[PDB]
Each structure stands twice: as C-alpha cells, then as structure tokens.
Design an enzyme around this catalytic site. Structure first.
Site, PDB file in Angstrom:
ATOM      1  N   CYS A 191       0.786  -1.243   0.000  1.00 17.92           N
ATOM      2  CA  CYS A 191       0.000   0.000   0.000  1.00 17.92           C
ATOM      3  C   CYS A 191       0.803   1.270   0.000  1.00 17.92           C
ATOM      4  O   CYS A 191       1.582   1.578   0.948  1.00 17.92           O
ATOM      5  CB  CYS A 191      -1.060   0.036   1.133  1.00 17.92           C
ATOM      6  N   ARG A 222      -0.166   4.756   2.690  1.00 17.32           N
ATOM      7  CA  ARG A 222      -0.079   4.582   4.167  1.00 17.32           C
ATOM      8  C   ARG A 222       0.209   5.812   5.016  1.00 17.32           C
ATOM      9  O   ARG A 222       0.064   5.751   6.223  1.00 17.32           O
ATOM     10  CB  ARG A 222       0.900   3.473   4.510  1.00 17.32           C
ATOM     11  N   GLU A 228      -4.300   3.503 -11.186  1.00 15.38           N
ATOM     12  CA  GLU A 228      -5.063   2.283 -10.980  1.00 15.38           C
ATOM     13  C   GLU A 228      -6.133   2.165 -12.058  1.00 15.38           C
ATOM     14  O   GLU A 228      -6.345   1.076 -12.583  1.00 15.38           O
ATOM     15  CB  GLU A 228      -5.710   2.262  -9.614  1.00 15.38           C
ATOM     16  N   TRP A 233      -9.124   6.029  -1.371  1.00 16.51           N
ATOM     17  CA  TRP A 233      -9.407   6.684  -2.642  1.00 16.51           C
ATOM     18  C   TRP A 233      -8.341   6.301  -3.686  1.00 16.51           C
ATOM     19  O   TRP A 233      -7.267   5.787  -3.352  1.00 16.51           O
ATOM     20  CB  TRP A 233      -9.480   8.196  -2.475  1.00 16.51           C
TER      21      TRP A 233
HETATM   22  C1  HEM Z   1      -6.205   6.605   1.644  1.00  9.05           C
HETATM   23  C2  HEM Z   1      -6.134   6.276   0.350  1.00  9.05           C
HETATM   24  C3  HEM Z   1      -5.342   5.073  -0.193  1.00  9.05           C
HETATM   25  C4  HEM Z   1      -4.541   5.067  -1.272  1.00  9.05           C
HETATM   26  C5  HEM Z   1      -4.190   6.262  -2.185  1.00  9.05           C
HETATM   27  C6  HEM Z   1      -4.026   3.724  -1.446  1.00  9.05           C
HETATM   28  C7  HEM Z   1      -3.158   3.305  -2.446  1.00  9.05           C
HETATM   29  C8  HEM Z   1      -3.037   1.978  -2.822  1.00  9.05           C
HETATM   30  C9  HEM Z   1      -2.690   1.425  -4.112  1.00  9.05           C
HETATM   31  C10 HEM Z   1      -2.341   2.270  -5.366  1.00  9.05           C
HETATM   32  C11 HEM Z   1      -2.685   0.091  -4.016  1.00  9.05           C
HETATM   33  C12 HEM Z   1      -2.373  -0.935  -5.128  1.00  9.05           C
HETATM   34  C13 HEM Z   1      -3.703  -1.451  -5.642  1.00  9.05           C
HETATM   35  C14 HEM Z   1      -3.649  -2.360  -6.848  1.00  9.05           C
HETATM   36  O1  HEM Z   1      -2.679  -2.393  -7.656  1.00  9.05           O
HETATM   37  O2  HEM Z   1      -4.647  -3.083  -7.031  1.00  9.05           O
HETATM   38  C15 HEM Z   1      -3.061  -0.257  -2.673  1.00  9.05           C
HETATM   39  C16 HEM Z   1      -3.144  -1.535  -2.158  1.00  9.05           C
HETATM   40  C17 HEM Z   1      -3.510  -1.874  -0.874  1.00  9.05           C
HETATM   41  N1  HEM Z   1      -3.941  -1.040   0.137  1.00  9.05           N
HETATM   42 FE1  HEM Z   1      -4.059   1.053  -0.009  1.00  9.05          FE
HETATM   43  N2  HEM Z   1      -4.572   2.928  -0.429  1.00  9.05           N
HETATM   44  C18 HEM Z   1      -5.377   3.731   0.366  1.00  9.05           C
HETATM   45  C19 HEM Z   1      -6.107   3.318   1.469  1.00  9.05           C
HETATM   46  C20 HEM Z   1      -6.002   2.079   2.073  1.00  9.05           C
HETATM   47  C21 HEM Z   1      -6.723   1.635   3.228  1.00  9.05           C
HETATM   48  C22 HEM Z   1      -7.742   2.514   4.014  1.00  9.05           C
HETATM   49  C23 HEM Z   1      -6.333   0.381   3.494  1.00  9.05           C
HETATM   50  C24 HEM Z   1      -6.791  -0.529   4.648  1.00  9.05           C
HETATM   51  C25 HEM Z   1      -7.277   0.000   5.783  1.00  9.05           C
HETATM   52  C26 HEM Z   1      -5.398  -0.037   2.475  1.00  9.05           C
HETATM   53  C27 HEM Z   1      -4.732  -1.243   2.411  1.00  9.05           C
HETATM   54  C28 HEM Z   1      -4.211  -1.772   1.272  1.00  9.05           C
HETATM   55  C29 HEM Z   1      -3.952  -3.181   1.045  1.00  9.05           C
HETATM   56  C30 HEM Z   1      -4.092  -4.371   2.043  1.00  9.05           C
HETATM   57  C31 HEM Z   1      -3.448  -3.229  -0.384  1.00  9.05           C
HETATM   58  C32 HEM Z   1      -3.004  -4.464  -1.218  1.00  9.05           C
HETATM   59  C33 HEM Z   1      -4.301  -4.933  -1.885  1.00  9.05           C
HETATM   60  C34 HEM Z   1      -4.034  -6.197  -2.626  1.00  9.05           C
HETATM   61  O3  HEM Z   1      -3.053  -6.903  -2.282  1.00  9.05           O
HETATM   62  O4  HEM Z   1      -4.780  -6.462  -3.584  1.00  9.05           O
HETATM   63  N3  HEM Z   1      -5.249   1.013   1.596  1.00  9.05           N
HETATM   64  N4  HEM Z   1      -3.239   0.917  -1.964  1.00  9.05           N
HETATM   65  C1  LIG Z   2      -9.141  -0.228  -0.587  1.00  6.59           C
HETATM   66  C2  LIG Z   2      -7.725  -0.091   0.028  1.00  6.59           C
HETATM   67  S1  LIG Z   2      -6.460   0.465  -1.122  1.00  6.59           S
HETATM   68  C3  LIG Z   2      -7.214   1.899  -1.921  1.00  6.59           C
HETATM   69  C4  LIG Z   2      -6.747   2.036  -3.390  1.00  6.59           C
HETATM   70  N1  LIG Z   2      -6.347   3.188  -3.763  1.00  6.59           N
HETATM   71  N2  LIG Z   2      -6.782   0.967  -4.268  1.00  6.59           N
HETATM   72  C5  LIG Z   2      -7.438  -0.311  -3.947  1.00  6.59           C
HETATM   73  C6  LIG Z   2      -7.471  -1.250  -5.190  1.00  6.59           C
HETATM   74  C7  LIG Z   2      -8.295  -0.632  -6.313  1.00  6.59           C
HETATM   75  C8  LIG Z   2      -8.079  -1.364  -7.645  1.00  6.59           C
HETATM   76  N3  LIG Z   2      -6.684  -1.250  -8.032  1.00  6.59           N
HETATM   77  C9  LIG Z   2      -8.934  -0.764  -8.738  1.00  6.59           C
HETATM   78  O1  LIG Z   2      -8.417  -0.240  -9.758  1.00  6.59           O
HETATM   79  O2  LIG Z   2     -10.169  -0.778  -8.620  1.00  6.59           O
END
Ligand code: HEM
Ligand SMILES: CCSCC(=N)NCCC[C@H](N)C(=O)O
Ligand code: HEM
Ligand SMILES: C[C@H](O)[C@H](O)[C@H]1CNc2nc(N)[nH]c(=O)c2N1
Ligand SMILES: C[C@H](O)[C@H](O)[C@H]1CNc2nc(N)[nH]c(=O)c2N1
Ligand SMILES: CCSCC(=N)NCCC[C@H](N)C(=O)O
Ligand SMILES: [Zn+2]
Lengths: 407, 411
Positions: free
Chosen positions: B108, B111, B285, B280
C-alpha cells in the site's frame, strides 16, 4: 521444490525446476525479501571446476564419457599441482555464453548464444589491453549494425596480479564538479573522472567528453589511453516533429559496454571481461537523460513543450518523458544504429522465457530490473511472475579497484 | 541486526530494526527470491501467544506496558481462551489493530494516512440483510459526496470456520463482465466469474459496459444473498480530456470509491474474514490498469486511433503516448467533479516521506517495491530509486480463497 510462475495477462503457467541447481545466495531470507536491493584455495576450487565441466560435457552430450572423465582428471591434476587451471577455448566460449544466459537482470538474453567471444588470455600489458579493446569496440559497433561481444583478459591468480578495466563502461561521458555548485556532464562519472584527471588526463571540460580508458594489467598501476575518436560511434538526438529538440545539444553513444564486472567460470575469476550489446531506448531516454541524478533534462524539455508545470497532476513530467524517448529511438533509427524499444525488447524476453522453460526448465529473472522504467504495465513482462536465483557461470559485481589497488 | 536501505537518487541510507519483529514467512529463501510472485480453525495453544504478542504491542503503543491494566487484560484474555477457546477484542484494541494492519500493508502506497482510518465495528451483525445495511452506511460515509474518507467495516470474527461472514464481491463497487458467445467480453473481464455467480444467484443483469454489480453477502456461514447498492449511493465519474473533445464519446466512466472487500484481517490471532475497507484512487489504478491492461477494458488501440498516432511500429511509442493522455483524462475528470484522487507523482512523494518518518519513529517500514512503483513512468517517481525491505508484520491484511471454492452449500 517444483515452482510455478503465472502470467496474469495470459494465464500461462510455467514450471521451474532449474532453480534446484541454484548455487549462490540471493540476499533474501524467509523473514525478509531483499529483491529491490541493488547489491544484497585448492579445496574450494575443485568442486567448482567439477560442477562446471559436468555441465559442459552434458551440454555436448558426452556426460560420463572417457573424454569427460579424462578432462576432470587433468584439471584435478593441474589444481593439485598449480593451484589453478586453464580452460580450453571451447569451455571458455561456453562459460561466457552461459554467464549471459544466467544473467537474471538482462532482458536481452534471447540473443545469448550468438555472443562473439574474444580470447585475450595472452594479454600481458595495458597497451595490449588497449589494442584488444579497440578491436572489440570496432567489431561490436560494426558501423551501426551492432553485434554482441565479450573480450576476456587473463584470470585472477593470487589477486596481486589482477587485470582490471577501471571504467564502468568502455564508453562513458565525463562528469565535473563546478565552482558554480552544479554538475557539468554526467554526474554518475564524477569520481572516476577525478581518478582520470589525477592520473594525468587533460579534460576538455565539456558536456559530452568520452572518458579515456584506464587499464590495469597484471596488477600493475593502471594507464590512460584515449579510444580512437573514429571508433566511438555517437548519435545526435532529434525529434521527428519538434524541430527545436536538436537545440538541446543532446547526443549519446551507440555502444553499451559494461566493463567493471567479473566473470566467474568453473571457479575461475576473470576480473577484466568487458562485454557489449546494444541499447534498449529507455536506458538512455528515461534513465540517462531523466534521472534527477543523471542529465536531469525533464524540466528543460517540458519548458520547450510549453506544458503546464504548475501541478504534478497535468502529468507534464510524463508527457515530456514520452517525447524524449521518441526522440532517442528516432535518432538511432535514422542514423541506422541498432536500438530496441521497450515493447519489442520485453516481448522478445517473454518468448525467450518460454523457450528456456521448455528447453532448460527455467530462466532466472529479476523482475525489478526486467520491467522497463517507463510504461511498465503496458509491456508483457509486468504481468509475468519471475523467479530470481543465482546460477553459475555468472557475471558478478566487484569492488571498484581504486578502493582496493595498492599503488 | 540492523539492515540498511539506500536511496540511489539522494544517497539517503536508512536503518531497519523493525524487521526483527517479523513473524510470518515471505516465500523467499537464501536460494530463491519470489518477490514478484502475486500469491507466494485455530488451537488454544497457538492462540494465546498471538493474543499476548498483540496486547503487549497495544499496551506499549498507549504507554501502559506492564501496568496493572495490561496484566489484568492478559489474565482475562487467557481465561477467556481456555473457557470459550477464542476471545473478544475491546473496541480500542480493534481500532488499534485495524489501523496497524493498514500500517503494515506492504503493497500500500497510501499509508501516510494510516492513522486517520474510520473504524466501523460491525461485530453485532448477524444476517446478510444486516451486512447490507452496514455496507451502505460505509459507502455513504466513505464517499462523503466526493470528499472521500478512509474507512473499514468489521464483521464478526471466525469461530469454527463453519460460520464465516464473507463479502463475496472482490470490491464493494465494481462493474460486471459478460463473456459473449463470440468470445468477446462486454464490461470488465476481471469480474466475469463473479458476475456469472450473481446471475446464477438470480441477479437480472442489465448487460451493459458499466453495470454496478450487486453485493453478494454471507452471514454466519449461511448461503449468501443478493442486494443492490442504492444507485444514489454509487458515485461515478464520466471520463473526459481537458483538450480532446472526442474523449468523452468513448463512453468511459469509473466509480469513485475503491473498497477491497475480499481480504482477511488478522488481529491478535483472530480472523475477521469480512472486513471491507476503502480509501481513494491513485489515477494509474484506473487509467493504466483498469483501462489499459489487455485483460481489462483494453482501450489503448481505440484511443491511439482517435489520436491518429502512427500505429504501424511500436517504436513510435504510440502506446506510451495514448497511455499518458488517458491518465491525464482520468485525473482531470475526478478533479473537475471534486472527487478525491491522487496522481502517481504526488502519491509516491508522500510515501517516501511516510517511509522515512516510519524508519525514524518505528525503526522500519515494510514495503513491496513490485507493488509500490506505479505501472507507468516508474523511474520518474522517487520510489523506483528507493531500496525497500519487504516482510510481514501483524496485525495484517491477508488474501483468502474465493468463497465459492470453499463454501458448503445449504441449498
Ligand atoms: C487513503 C487512500 C489510499 C490510497 C491512495 C491507497 C493506495 C493503494 C494502491 C495504489 C494500491 C495498489 C492497488 C492495486 O494495484 O490493485 C493499494 C493496495 C492496498 N492497500 Fe491502499 N490505499 C489507500 C487506502 C487504504 C486503506 C484505508 C487500506 C486498509 C485499511 C489499504 C490497504 C491496502 C492493502 C491491504 C493493499 C493491497 C491490496 C491487494 O493486495 O490487492 N489502503 N493501496
Ligand atoms: C481499498 C484499500 S487500497 C485503496 C486504493 N487506492 N486501491 C485499492 C485497489 C483498487 C483497484 N486497483 C482498482 O483499480 O479498482
Ligand atoms: C544484445 C543486446 C542486449 C540487450 C538488448 C540487453 C539489455 C539489457 C538491459 C536493458 C539491461 C539493464 C541495464 C541497466 O538497467 O543498466 C541489461 C543488463 C545486463 N545485461 Fe544485457 N543486453 C544485451 C546484451 C548483453 C550481453 C552481450 C551480455 C553479456 C555478455 C549482457 C549481460 C547483462 C548483465 C550482466 C546485466 C546487469 C548489469 C548490471 O547489473 O549493471 N547483456 N541488459
Ligand atoms: C532500488 C531499485 O532496486 C533500483 O532503483 C533499481 C530498480 N530497477 C532497475 N532496473 C534496471 N534495469 N536498472 C536499474 O538501474 C534499476 N534500478
Ligand atoms: C507478476 C507481478 O508481480 C504482477 O503483475 C504485479 C506487479 N506489480 C503490481 N503492482 C500493483 N500495484 N498492482 C498489481 O496488480 C501488480 N501486479
Ligand atoms: C553490455 C551488457 S547489457 C547491454 C545494454 N543494453 N545495456 C547495458 C547497460 C547500459 C546502461 N544502462 C546505459 O544506459 O548506458
Ligand atoms: Zn526476495
């Protein structure tokens, strides 16, 4: 112990068995992954020799033959007596081709078996090394129709008598600290340019000065030589639509030739083993031109394109980056100097991967290095799972020699 | 043991000690790196250590380690485990735990925000209709009319593994995909399988390019049930380009709320198999992956055609040119409608600041380079140049098998 890699774009699944022959260590543990880190006696030598000769004889389908057993005996005798041994020409060629085959960070390995090997084990002096290098350069450059090559200097003995090319590539541009505070030329090469100047080089103090070679033979103090200018093929950079691009005064050299690595074959160490291929466009256009710590030209190009640089969200850095890379590819192609774009290169490597899984049972690949530094996910390598491991013969990094060399 | 990571652009060297607190394994050995591999019913005996470990961390975080309240809570959890074989988290420990799973999520890039998570405690939920109500509230709270807020909703934990709460959707809001008799796909091809299940369960599919899927919800190990999210709660953005007026006629839109709903939250040994969370979007993405993957909406050709790019040779970089324009369009569209989104430059820069701060304050920041680096323009973002260490801390978010593979149907 049998491993699967999936391509997430094609659902194609491959089985890796080759990793069980992995010899060296990756840097990772079961607790920590270090995949993104850049740099993670007679007794030892004989298993190393045996291991290599076993793979050689198997490769020519004479495993366990009298010629196999006899060479093992012969090398064994030679180590016991001389504490080292000599490769036959055929073994040297095979070892080098395979060091390239095994190079997990190289996207160009589809070509691995066409490597031209120049055996320079008879070299004794720096002048000799200079002659061998110019011949490599001319042979590889080939008036623009580049051909892969490696030139192999004598192996390490007691490590007091090492052959080294002090340059990181045969061809590179100088870097100069300035009174100004800024940096003129390539900032990556500042310290080595300092080594050159303090060994006697007359620097012209320009933006694109080809560095002199600094060559060490038989562990002696290294010596300077300028590569004949007429052997250094260079390309001026223009854009097929932006007439103003030429005004930036940008050029690059045609021949990528890594010269600071160490070739290990059957436990033997070749500390001077310059090798060369040809460029993938992104190497110059994205990395050499756009790294903040390199020529760092993005701002200037963006300004010339009249983009809105007020906010990162206009993606102005990204727009300029693309155009710069278009200009690199265009300029090499117009001047007929071999170059490959990242689409074509990655597509090739995917085909190489499948061949290697089918014919060898695997292909070590460092995903972090193989995925191009622009447009990652629109190249197929991005979606390809890779396993990284260390097979021998190999190219390895080695300490810069000015940290080591006793003058 | 101290481990150093170097930034190759700035020559900043950081020192990781946090990795010493790592428990779970990576897939990697001394002989093999699996850093690019996508995916590389407990006992009382195994439960109390995990409980204890977690509560020692909790009580340290609040500066009450070794206090009477700390010792009393250990004894109480211990006694609850022996008597009932499981245990219940206090509200405070649940909040802290969920925040920390986010903090420890190595893939993520978002963070920097970990501390601002809104936690909705849904552990009193008993039915699928109950889950639906919780999920609508989450969507509406998190959407906040385009000014997005991070949130997580936490349903009851696993007990015997026969009574699991699951959200069968992979995200709360996602578009349907329909395989056609001719082999073509309409809508999003990532969701074909899950769409087929929805139809089998009785969803009447509109069959267009952008049909918001129904929620498929399992409570207390029962067969799941279908629910339509109220459309008024589904914030969408039509996609246009600031300079190309034909861009809108591609018919593209996307939803503003990304909310992953298929992962498992582990806290102090406990397994929360339904814990949808949302933040968000980062623009790539959508504009890189969702739009331009060959196995997703795959619009690169159609866009470069309209741009009149030279398409006969990959070496004109027509693909790279079209990709940038699509990404500009996504960011422009979200910003114009005042829906929270972050560009990849801004997001990675923020992450680098977050990472350094984490090293100074926590002694580390586990990060997965393969995931952190954006899928376009990698090296012009500072993360590309950042060495990272990847390892697994608890609390954590984990993958789990898709529920249709394991669920015991009742009929
Ligand atoms: C606040 C805005 C956030 C942004 C901008 C963000 C950004 C991102 C991005 C760009 C990814 C990669 C997604 C992909 O390639 O499918 C990701 C993955 C992830 N995020 Fe965040 N995130 C946010 C919030 C959160 C929150 C609130 C959580 C949990 C409380 C979280 C937990 C994770 C986890 C566990 C992954 C890996 C998901 C997977 O393995 O498919 N994220 N995040
Ligand atoms: C929900 C926790 S991480 C927030 C985020 N920014 N991405 C989540 C993955 C979205 C996916 N890659 C999509 O293109 O729909
Ligand atoms: C013939 C065309 C070739 C192509 C298109 C090619 C492509 C590439 C590229 C793009 C890289 C990344 C370099 C960087 O990011 O700095 C690389 C690295 C590397 N290549 Fe190749 N290569 C070619 C030939 C060769 C040859 C002939 C050898 C050895 C005989 C070789 C061995 C290596 C090694 C050891 C690395 C990693 C070097 C390092 O760690 O700095 N390559 N190659
Ligand atoms: C820290 C990170 O490993 C470093 O920036 C790497 C990433 N990938 C790379 N990939 C290639 N091909 N060349 C490089 O120099 C790098 N640098
Ligand atoms: C095989 C490879 O790890 C896979 O394509 C990964 C690469 N990096 C990624 N990075 C992010 N953020 N999201 C992804 O889905 C992927 N896919
Ligand atoms: C010589 C073996 S690999 C051939 C290659 N294509 N690149 C090598 C490294 C060149 C460097 N990245 C540069 O941009 O100068
Ligand atoms: Zn690893």
């Amino acid at each position: 112990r049998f491993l699967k890699v999936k391509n997430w774009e094609t659902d194609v699944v491959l089985t890796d068995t080759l990793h069980l022959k992995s010899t060296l260590e990756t840097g990772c543990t079961e607790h920590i992954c270090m995949g993104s880190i850049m740099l993670p006696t007679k007794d030892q030598l004989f298993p190393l020799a045996k291991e290599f000769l076993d793979q050689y004889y198997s490769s020519i389908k004479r495993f366990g033959s009298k010629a196999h057993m006899d060479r093992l005996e012969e090398v064994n005798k030679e180590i016991e007596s001389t504490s080292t041994y000599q490769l036959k020409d055929t073994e040297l060629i095979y070892g080098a081709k395979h060091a390239w085959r095994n190079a997990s960070r190289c996207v160009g390995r589809i070509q691995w078996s066409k490597l031209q090997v120049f055996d320079a084990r008879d070299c004794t002096t720096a002048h000799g090394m200079f002659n061998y290098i110019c011949n490599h350069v001319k042979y590889a450059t080939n008036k623009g129709n580049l051909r892969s090559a490696i030139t192999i200097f004598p192996q390490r003995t007691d490590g007091k008598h090492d052959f080294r090319v002090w340059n990181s590539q045969l061809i590179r541009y100088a870097g100069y600290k300035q009174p100004d505070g800024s940096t003129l030329g390539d900032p990556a090469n500042v310290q080595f340019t300092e080594i050159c100047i303090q060994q006697g080089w007359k620097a012209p103090r320009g933006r694109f000065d080809v560095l002199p070679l600094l060559l060490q033979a038989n562990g002696n103090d290294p010596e300077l030589f300028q590569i004949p200018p007429e052997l250094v093929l260079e390309v001026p950079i223009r854009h097929p639509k932006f007439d103003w691009f030429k005004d930036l005064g940008l050029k690059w050299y045609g021949l990528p030739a890594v010269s600071n690595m160490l070739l290990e074959i059957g436990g033997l160490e070749f500390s001077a083993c310059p090798f060369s291929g040809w460029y993938m466009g992104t190497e110059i256009g994205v990395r050499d031109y756009c790294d903040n710590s390199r020529y760092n030209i993005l701002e200037e190009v963006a300004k010339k394109m009249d983009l809105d640089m007020r906010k990162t969200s206009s993606l102005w850095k990204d727009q300029a980056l693309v155009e710069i890379n278009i200009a690199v590819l265009y300029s090499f192609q117009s001047d007929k100097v071999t170059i490959v774009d990242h689409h074509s290169a990655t597509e090739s490597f995917i085909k190489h991967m499948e061949n290697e899984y089918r014919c060898r049972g695997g292909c070590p690949a460092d995903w972090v290095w193989i995925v191009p530094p622009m447009s990652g996910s629109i190249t197929p390598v991005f979606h390809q799972e890779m396993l990284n491991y260390r097979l021998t013969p190999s190219f390895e990094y080695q300490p810069d020699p000015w940290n080591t060399h006793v003058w």
